[PDB]
Design a protein around this ligand. Structure first.
Ligand SMILES: O=C(N[C@@H](COC(=O)[C@@H](CO)NC(=O)c1cccc(O)c1O)C(=O)O)c1cccc(O)c1O
Ligand SMILES: N[C@H](CO)C(=O)OC[C@@H](N)C(=O)OC[C@H](NC(=O)c1cccc(O)c1O)C(=O)O
Ligand SMILES: [Fe+3]
Length: 174
């Protein structure tokens, strides 16, 4: 119940010329970091997928599919376009008990291989933040992973708060 403080938004770059149409589709979480994320070598974090779908109103339908307790859970929420392109807020925030704020900032992406996305939420008055290294495939170059590690560290996170989920085939394919 001690959190590393969220960084100031100045330390989180924004992906320039964000193309919402090109960001659509399935992304694999090849890297995950955050002040509430901890490496667990006893029971390692399994890889999951997050699928982005533009609706007519240009807001995203965001579905995360995860393999947990031998079934696939489906975490659904809406990302509403924020102050500038590549920046979002959470739609229908009142339906999530405790949530007072939620921010999404796409830091960098080339749209067809990889992406880094910054998340910040204030839940039960506690300020959580996270970065995900998204991949179009389950594997990415060690270079991109090291860059993700360097970015996470630049935001105050030590490497025991930086995990690389293990590739799986259940649920996240198809
Ligand atoms: O399942 C995920 N989480 C938890 C959510 O519980 C929480 O600790 C408080 N959460 C929010 O109130 C929240 C609200 C809206 C959006 C969110 O992201 C929230 O976390 C869960 O459902 O088990 C999840 C999966 C994939 C990716 C994620 O980022 C997840 O959180
Ligand atoms: N189900 C998967 C793990 O199998 C999962 O929820 O991990 C993703 C991660 N973002 C997360 O939700 O874990 C920590 C959790 N959430 C965050 O730290 C978090 C932080 C910033 C933005 C978010 O949407 C978050 O969910 C928490 O508050 O304890
Ligand atoms: Fe979450």
């Amino acid at each position: 119940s001690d959190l590393i403080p969220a960084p100031p938004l100045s330390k989180v770059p924004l992906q320039q010329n964000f193309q919402d149409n090109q960001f659509q589709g399935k992304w694999y979480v090849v890297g995950l970091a955050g002040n509430a994320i901890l490496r667990e070598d006893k029971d390692p974090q399994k890889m999951y997928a997050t699928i982005y779908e533009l609706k007519e109103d240009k807001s995203y339908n965001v579905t995360s599919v995860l393999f947990r307790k031998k079934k696939c859970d489906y975490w659904i929420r809406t990302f509403v376009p924020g102050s500038q392109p590549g920046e979002f807020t959470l739609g229908n925030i009142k339906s999530y008990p405790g949530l007072t704020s939620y921010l999404v900032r796409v830091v960098s992406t080339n749209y067809n291989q990889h992406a880094m996305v910054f998340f910040k939420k204030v839940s039960q008055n506690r300020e959580y933040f996270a970065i995900t290294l998204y991949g179009r495939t389950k594997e990415l170059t060690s270079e991109l992973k090291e860059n993700f590690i360097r970015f996470s560290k630049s935001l105050g996170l030590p490497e025991n708060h930086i995990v690389f989920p293990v590739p799986i085939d259940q649920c996240i394919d198809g």
